[PDB]
Design an enzyme around this catalytic site. Structure first.
Site, PDB file in Angstrom:
ATOM      1  N   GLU A   7     -36.670  14.188   9.563  1.00  0.00           N
ATOM      2  CA  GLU A   7     -37.509  12.960  10.402  1.00  0.00           C
ATOM      3  C   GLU A   7     -38.401  14.517  11.141  1.00  0.00           C
ATOM      4  OE1 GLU A   7     -36.966  10.127   9.830  1.00  0.00           O
ATOM      5  OE2 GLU A   7     -35.811   9.618   9.232  1.00  0.00           O
ATOM      6  N   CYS A  26     -41.651   0.710  -6.085  1.00  0.00           N
ATOM      7  CA  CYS A  26     -41.624  -0.348  -5.069  1.00  0.00           C
ATOM      8  C   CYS A  26     -41.202  -2.006  -5.145  1.00  0.00           C
ATOM      9  CB  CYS A  26     -43.361  -1.253  -5.708  1.00  0.00           C
ATOM     10  SG  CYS A  26     -44.062  -1.903  -4.529  1.00  0.00           S
ATOM     11  N   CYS A  38     -43.094  -5.337  -6.142  1.00  0.00           N
ATOM     12  CA  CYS A  38     -43.911  -5.659  -7.107  1.00  0.00           C
ATOM     13  C   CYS A  38     -41.900  -5.124  -7.659  1.00  0.00           C
ATOM     14  CB  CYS A  38     -44.241  -5.198  -8.013  1.00  0.00           C
ATOM     15  SG  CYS A  38     -44.364  -3.492  -7.916  1.00  0.00           S
TER      16      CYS A  38
HETATM   17  C1  LIG Z   1     -43.992   4.619   7.710  1.00  0.00           C
HETATM   18  C2  LIG Z   1     -43.399   4.920   9.269  1.00  0.00           C
HETATM   19  C3  LIG Z   1     -42.102   5.230  10.093  1.00  0.00           C
HETATM   20  N1  LIG Z   1     -41.761   5.279  10.981  1.00  0.00           N
HETATM   21  C4  LIG Z   1     -40.593   5.405  11.262  1.00  0.00           C
HETATM   22  C5  LIG Z   1     -39.475   4.928  10.669  1.00  0.00           C
HETATM   23  C6  LIG Z   1     -38.351   5.525  10.580  1.00  0.00           C
HETATM   24  O1  LIG Z   1     -37.257   5.600  11.470  1.00  0.00           O
HETATM   25  C7  LIG Z   1     -38.311   6.906  10.126  1.00  0.00           C
HETATM   26  C8  LIG Z   1     -38.785   7.098   8.809  1.00  0.00           C
HETATM   27  O2  LIG Z   1     -37.186   7.780   8.801  1.00  0.00           O
HETATM   28  P1  LIG Z   1     -37.834   8.524   7.241  1.00  0.00           P
HETATM   29  O3  LIG Z   1     -38.356  10.006   6.751  1.00  0.00           O
HETATM   30  O4  LIG Z   1     -38.641   7.338   5.898  1.00  0.00           O
HETATM   31  O5  LIG Z   1     -36.257   9.283   7.068  1.00  0.00           O
HETATM   32  O6  LIG Z   1     -40.460   7.083  10.553  1.00  0.00           O
HETATM   33  C9  LIG Z   1     -42.797   5.730  11.933  1.00  0.00           C
HETATM   34  O7  LIG Z   1     -42.422   5.869  13.374  1.00  0.00           O
HETATM   35  N2  LIG Z   1     -43.804   5.237  11.825  1.00  0.00           N
HETATM   36  C10 LIG Z   1     -44.521   4.966  10.294  1.00  0.00           C
HETATM   37  O8  LIG Z   1     -45.016   4.924  10.166  1.00  0.00           O
HETATM   38 ZN   LIG Z   2     -45.713  -2.830  -5.934  1.00  0.00          ZN
END
Ligand SMILES: CC1CN([C@H]2C[C@H](O)[C@@H](COP(=O)(O)O)O2)C(=O)NC1=O
Ligand SMILES: [Zn+2]
Ligand SMILES: CC1CN([C@H]2C[C@H](O)[C@@H](COP(=O)(O)O)O2)C(=O)NC1=O
Ligand SMILES: CC1CN([C@H]2C[C@H](O)[C@@H](COP(=O)(O)O)O2)C(=O)NC1=O
Ligand SMILES: CC1CN([C@H]2C[C@H](O)[C@@H](COP(=O)(O)O)O2)C(=O)NC1=O
Ligand SMILES: [Zn+2]
Ligand SMILES: [Zn+2]
Ligand SMILES: [Zn+2]
Lengths: 164, 164, 161, 165
Positions: free
Chosen positions: B66, B121, B124
Site C-alpha cells: 500500500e 472490469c 462489464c
Molecule cells: C482507488 C483508491 C484507493 N484507496 C485506498 C483504498 C484501499 O484501502 C487501498 C487500495 O489497496 P491496494 O493498493 O489495492 O492493495 O487504497 C485510496 O485511498 N484512494 C484511492 O483513490
Molecule cells: Zn468495463
C-alpha cells in the site's frame, strides 16, 4: 491496451519495441500514424507539440508517439486519441539525467492500460542491468538531444559512483 | 546489489498477492524479509516509514504494501536499496480520479523493475481493467476500504460511470 | 497478454500456484465462476477424464500441478474450444532437467506462456530456473516439498550433480 | 553466469525484432555478439546446423540464434554455450502451421532461464491477439521458407474456422 506506454532509460530499445508493436499492427492491415519530435534525428510527421498534428491522426487505427518526454501535452493527446478508439503507443523516458521524473510521462503511467519498463545494460560496469541514464557532458539544459556521445545507461550503483 | 521493484495497477489486480509471491520466493532461499504495512519474516504497521526506524537494516528484503499511503516512500526505498536491500513495493499508481500518486510516480523513475497489473472490469465483466472507480460519495483522497467502496473498471466503463 | 489457454511454468518454489490463484481471484472478483482442479469449484482427480462434464458450468478452469495429468493438453484444448478460460500451473522440467512432454506440448497450444523463476536455495544469490531432488529416488513422480527438492540456478544445478 | 533466453510465438510477432533489441542492448555495453542465421564486435554466420559453426562462438559474450526451429541440434548447442558462460538468446517458432510443436524448441523451454511467448495480431479478423500461424498455400512440407505470401498469423477461433474446409 488503448494507451500502451514503454519506458526505461536510454539504450533500452524502447523505440525498437515501439516499432515492433507497430509492425505487428501493420501486418494485420491496420493503419499506423507515427509521430516524432522535431529535433530528434517509418515516420509520418515530426512536430514540436502534439497540437500541431491537427486532426490527421483520426484517419488511423494506431497512433505511435516516439520520445514522448519531449512533448509537453502528451498525456492529453493520448487520452483524447484513446477515447476516440485509437490504440496509442508511446515510447518515452520516465526519468531525466538527474533521476527526476518527466512529470507528463508519470501522468501517462496512471492513464495507461499497459506499462512496461525496459532496461539497458550498464555501460560503465558492463555486468548488470541498467535502469538509469547518466549525462556524460556538462550541461544544465534538461532537454539536450544526443546519443552515446552525451549519455550512457548505468545500473544503480554506477549511477551513484559517477555522481560522486 | 540492492534493487527497487515496483508493482502497480488498480485495485483488485492482485498487487499484494504478487508482492507476497515474490517475498515467499526469497523466504524459501532463507533470505530474511521485513514486511511493512500501513496501520525471519518480521511485520510492522506504521503511518510513515520514518517510524520504522532502523530495524529494517537487519533484513535482506524489505516489502512495502500500500505504498501510496506513505508520503516518504521514495526516499525510504532509495535509502534501503543503496544499503543493498531488495525493496519491493506494491502500490496504486492512480487515485479514484485517475490522478497519479506523485510519490509512486517518483518511484517509477527510481525503480529497477516496474510491472503494472490489471484487474477485471467489475462493471462489464468483459475486459481488463486498469482503473479504480469509487462507489461511495467522498472527497477524501485517502479512504481505506474494499469492494464496498471501490470497483475496478476498464477505460470505457470508467467514462460511462463518471457521466451518470 | 492473456487468452483462452494460459500456461504458468517454472521450477518448484517459483510461486506458480500463487500466480494461478492470483489470476483466479481476479476473475472471481468480476463474478466469473471458477473451477479448480488439483491432483490426487474444487475437485481432486488423478486424470482429467474423471472430472466429467462439471467444468462446463464454469467460466474459468484452473488446473494446478499440470505435469501430473497425462491428458492435460487434450483437456485444455477441449475446454478452450468450448469458450473457457483455462489456466494451468505446471512444471516444465523434471528433476533431471528433462521436459514433461505433455506440457511442452501445451506451450505450443497456449495463448500465453509465462515462465517464473525461484531463488537459488543453494547459493542464495541468483535466480533459479531448475529443480534439484535432494533425496535418492528414481520415481519420476515423487510428491513432496522442500524436504525432497530445492530450486537452483544453472551452475548450482551442475555442481550438485 | 551463462543463461539461455528463449523468444517464441507465431509468425509476425516480432520475435526477430526482439532478439535484435536484446542483442543491441549488449552491444551498447561493449559486449561481443555472434549472430547465427539459417542457410564491440558483432559477427554473423549462416549455417544449416550448429555443428557447422565450429568453435568461433567461444570468442564472444553473447550468442544469438534466429529461426531456431530450423536447427535440429539447437538445444545441445545452447546448453554447451550457456555452460561455457555465454548469454544465449534464441528466437524460434514454438509451433508449426498444424499447431504441432517443434520438439527441439520445447526441449529448450525446459532448459531456459527465460521464456517469452510473443503474440501477433490476427491477420484475419484484425481484432484479437494471435498465437498461431496458418499456412495460406497448399504444401505438406513442414519446412517451407516464406513470408506473408505463404503464411498469416491468426487467433484461436480464426485458426479453427479457416481449418474447416
Ligand atoms: C482507488 C483508491 C484507493 N484507496 C485506498 C483504498 C484501499 O484501502 C487501498 C487500495 O489497496 P491496494 O493498493 O489495492 O492493495 O487504497 C485510496 O485511498 N484512494 C484511492 O483513490
Ligand atoms: Zn468495463
Ligand atoms: C536522459 C536524457 C535524455 N535526453 C534526450 C537524449 C535523446 O535525444 C533523447 C532520448 O531518446 P530515447 O528515448 O533514449 O530513444 O532524450 C534529454 O533531453 N534529457 C535527459 O535527461
Ligand atoms: C521436480 C519434480 C517435482 N515433482 C513433484 C513434487 C511436488 O509434488 C510437485 C511440485 O509442483 P509445484 O512446483 O508445486 O507446481 O511436483 C515431481 O513429481 N517430479 C519432479 O521431477
Ligand atoms: C509456421 C511455419 C513457418 N515456416 C517457415 C516460414 C518462415 O521462413 C519461418 C518462420 O519465420 P519466423 O520464425 O517468424 O521468423 O519458418 C515453416 O517452415 N513451417 C511452418 O510450419
Ligand atoms: Zn554498473
Ligand atoms: Zn545458485
Ligand atoms: Zn481472428
Amino acid at each position: 491496451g488503448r494507451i500502451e506506454l514503454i519506458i526505461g532509460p536510454m539504450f533500452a530499445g524502447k523505440t525498437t519495441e515501439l516499432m515492433r508493436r507497430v509492425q505487428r499492427h501493420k501486418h494485420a492491415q491496420r493503419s499506423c500514424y507515427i509521430i516524432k519530435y522535431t529535433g530528434d534525428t517509418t515516420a509520418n510527421v515530426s512536430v514540436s507539440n502534439l497540437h500541431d498534428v491537427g486532426d490527421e491522426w483520426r484517419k488511423y487505427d494506431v497512433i505511435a508517439v516516439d520520445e514522448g518526454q519531449f512533448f509537453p501535452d502528451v498525456a492529453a493527446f493520448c487520452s483524447k486519441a484513446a477515447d476516440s478508439g485509437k490504440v496509442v503507443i508511446v515510447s518515452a523516458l520516465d526519468a531525466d539525467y538527474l533521476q527526476e521524473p518527466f512529470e507528463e510521462i508519470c501522468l501517462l503511467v496512471s492513464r495507461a492500460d499497459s506499462v512496461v519498463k525496459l532496461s539497458a545494460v550498464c555501460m560503465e560496469c558492463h555486468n548488470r542491468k541498467a535502469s538509469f541514464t547518466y549525462r556524460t557532458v556538462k550541461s544544465d539544459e534538461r532537454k539536450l538531444v544526443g546519443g552515446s556521445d552525451m549519455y550512457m545507461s548505468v545500473c544503480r550503483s554506477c549511477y551513484e559512483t559517477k555522481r560522486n
